[PDB]
Design a protein around this ligand. Structure first.
Ligand SMILES: [Cu+]
Length: 655
């Protein structure tokens, strides 16, 4: 029961990873959800600056990941994804993090072709009047300071919960001694009110808000505001009849209000195409809901239900009267709506427990998706007509999967193989952000097709006594993979969205071995591969082969760890192609990074941990990081470097 620092998370059951995000993590995360995914093999992160990275799973970017918080969807507003869904999540304020790899669930929404990520808080369990406090403080290099408070009180009949955090860092340094533009601040406060009139009934109301700022080495602008407001209502009814085990009902409202500019966290670049102050303000308003029934009987479990979603995007921008040298801020103009999305779906998942060592799971959903272009004009001696103003388009998209899981007779082994098909309607960035659509189209909104993935997943679990191992591989094809291509034109850079066909394959594996009662070791490996077979070319933005080796010594109340991370070169690139955020340009160099950690339980209630990240102060960058901005002194296509040696200390309280 000795405390330790988390450097990797294993796969605990076929395709699924479950972890407590309150444990200290050894490459210390920045209070965002992308960094908490770095310890799960198969995840990589596009670095923008000090925080708010964009998560990449098995080489898949963006909405191919379905990222939920308490069952709801929080979508960002930045047309350049400065505020990806994970940038609104502070994972320490949650209780559980679940990842399901591959298109192997239908219960949580449309289009999760790459995987599903679920951040959860679990309702209190008070049986008598009482209270609960969890908290933590973290301090480290470069002004890093974090506070987290999670308190609740209640009784058999109901409860009140408050969770909040405040977190910040100054600019960090790379391993060559340069200050990287990358300071950030984040804070959140949320309340939950729970009513439990009896054991079979839970009704819970939630409301919360947060804000932040972030300096972006890899952008022409910084994020000076990331406002979030959230409202939720969920209802669980248990043991309704002998076969109706559970009924779930949930609605959520999430509002993002984002500002980026070139003068609040930097000064305007004199040699850029924005030498004058400029700010843009955008928001995203999201309303959605879910209703699901769970039936159990004989050797069968059936989960059935429907879900719905609507979201809306608006924007307004500042103006700079050159002649009088006068600046009118963006909040002096009306909001201007530009897009509305809708989705309605019906879904079901049946499970058969054949005998005791055999499981068969099948799932299906049908989705009705639609979008409307509300842009009355476009940008380009200022504006131009939008040829699809007020147009609508829609599609209906079936998805499903089958999965077989067999447990061996002799060893504690599970084998599994699964077939999944997933169809995803294009998202805001794929339709509204490209400057051009496919050749011969009027724009991207009018022509980009839905993306259709067919994938075979397979793997094994070995749950031995000294040895714990797992592996998970996948082969698939993507029809109408949505791809970005980049051109110069001496107008800045400009993008084109196209549909192409693709092959993908890869996998993750890992093991941990209890050497002695004190000594444990573990390792992991992750590989992704992709081909643009429409163009006989590699897919862009695929992270290279990556390995982790850990060693831990634990002894009563304390433990000590060492971690090695070793990353291969990525020589498979597609220059000037990528997504809405990034593009390939050069092959990447391989590297190794080394870290140490320790932990110590002082009392039942107080536990301590500390680490040194990147002990040897290695100067390195990752394949997927953004190119640095010229106005900060970055040449060429020099990508943002990773941090050099950093120290941190954490104390966890629990009462
Ligand atoms: Cu932005």
């Amino acid at each position: 029961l000795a405390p330790s620092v988390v450097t990797g998370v294993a796969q605990s059951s076929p395709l699924t990873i479950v972890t407590n995000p309150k444990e200290p993590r050894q490459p210390v995360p920045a209070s965002d959800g992308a960094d908490y995914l770095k310890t799960i093999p198969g995840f990589a992160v596009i670095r923008n600056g000090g925080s708010n990275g964009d998560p990449v799973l098995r080489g898949m970017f963006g909405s191919r990941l379905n990222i939920l918080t308490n069952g709801g969807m929080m979508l960002g507003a930045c047309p350049n994804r400065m505020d990806a869904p994970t940038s609104y999540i502070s994972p320490e304020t949650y209780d559980k993090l679940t990842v399901i790899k591959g298109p192997q669930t239908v219960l949580w929404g449309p289009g999760a072709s790459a995987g599903t990520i679920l951040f959860e808080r679990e309702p209190e369990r008070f049986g008598e009047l009482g209270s609960r406090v969890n908290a933590s403080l973290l301090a480290g290099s470069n002004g890093r300071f974090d506070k987290v408070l999670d308190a609740a009180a209640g009784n058999r009949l109901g409860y009140l919960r408050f969770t909040g955090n405040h977190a910040q860092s100054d600019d960090y340094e790379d391993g060559a001694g340069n200050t990287v533009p990358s300071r950030w601040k984040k804070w959140n406060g949320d309340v939950a009110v729970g009513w439990t009139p009896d054991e079979d009934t839970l009704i819970e109301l939630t409301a919360g808000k947060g804000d932040g700022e972030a300096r972006y080495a890899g952008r022409g602008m910084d994020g000076s505001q990331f406002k979030r407001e959230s409202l939720g209502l969920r209802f669980v009814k248990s043991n309704v009849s002998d076969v109706l085990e559970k009924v779930e009902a949930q609605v959520y409202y999430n509002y993002a209000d984002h500002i980026h500019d070139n003068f609040r966290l930097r000064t305007p670049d004199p040699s850029s195409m924005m030498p004058m102050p400029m700010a843009s303000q955008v928001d995203r308003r999201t309303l959605g809901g879910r209703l699901a029934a769970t039936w159990r009987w004989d050797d069968f479990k059936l989960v059935t239900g429907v879900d719905a979603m609507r979201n809306e995007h608006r924007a307004r921008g500042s103006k700079y009267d050159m002649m009088t040298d006068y600046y009118t801020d963006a909040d002096q103009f009306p909001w201007s709506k530009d897009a509305v999305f809708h989705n309605y779906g019906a879904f079901g998942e049946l499970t058969w427990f054949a005998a005791e060592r055999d499981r068969l799971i099948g799932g299906l959903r049908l989705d009705r998706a639609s979008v409307k272009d509300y842009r009355q004009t476009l940008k380009s001696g200022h504006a131009m007509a939008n040829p699809t103003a007020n147009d609508t388009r829609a599609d209906t998209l079936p998805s499903g999967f089958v999965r077989y899981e067999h447990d061996l007779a002799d060893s504690p082994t599970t084998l599994y193989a699964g077939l999944g098909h997933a169809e995803r309607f294009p998202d805001y960035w794929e339709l509204f952000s490209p400057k051009r659509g496919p050749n011969g189209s009027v724009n991207a909104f009018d022509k980009i097709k839905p993306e259709k993935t067919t994938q075979l997943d397979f793997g094994l679990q070995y749950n031995g006594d000294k040895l714990q191992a797992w592996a998970s591989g996948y082969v698939g094809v993507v029809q109408d993979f949505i791809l970005f291509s980049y051109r110069e034109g001496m107008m800045g850079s400009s993008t084109q969205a196209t549909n192409v066909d693709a092959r993908i394959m890869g996998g993750e594996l890992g093991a941990s071995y209890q050497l002695t009662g004190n000594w444990k070791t573990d390792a992991s490996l992750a590989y992704a591969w992709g081909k643009n077979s429409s163009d006989d070319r590699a897919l862009p933005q695929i992270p290279p082969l990556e390995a982790r080796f850990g060693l831990t010594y634990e002894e009563g109340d304390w433990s000590a760890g060492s971690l090695w991370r070793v990353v291969a070169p990525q020589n498979r690139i597609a220059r000037d192609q990528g997504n809405v955020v990034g593009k390939d340009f050069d092959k990447s160099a391989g590297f190794g990074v080394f870290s140490l950690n320790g932990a110590y339980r002082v009392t039942r209630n107080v536990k301590l941990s500390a680490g040194v990240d990147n002990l040897f102060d290695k100067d390195y960058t990752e394949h997927l990081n953004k190119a640095g901005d010229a106005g900060f002194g970055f040449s060429a296509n020099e990508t943002v470097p990773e941090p050099g040696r950093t120290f941190w200390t954490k104390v966890d309280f629990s009462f």
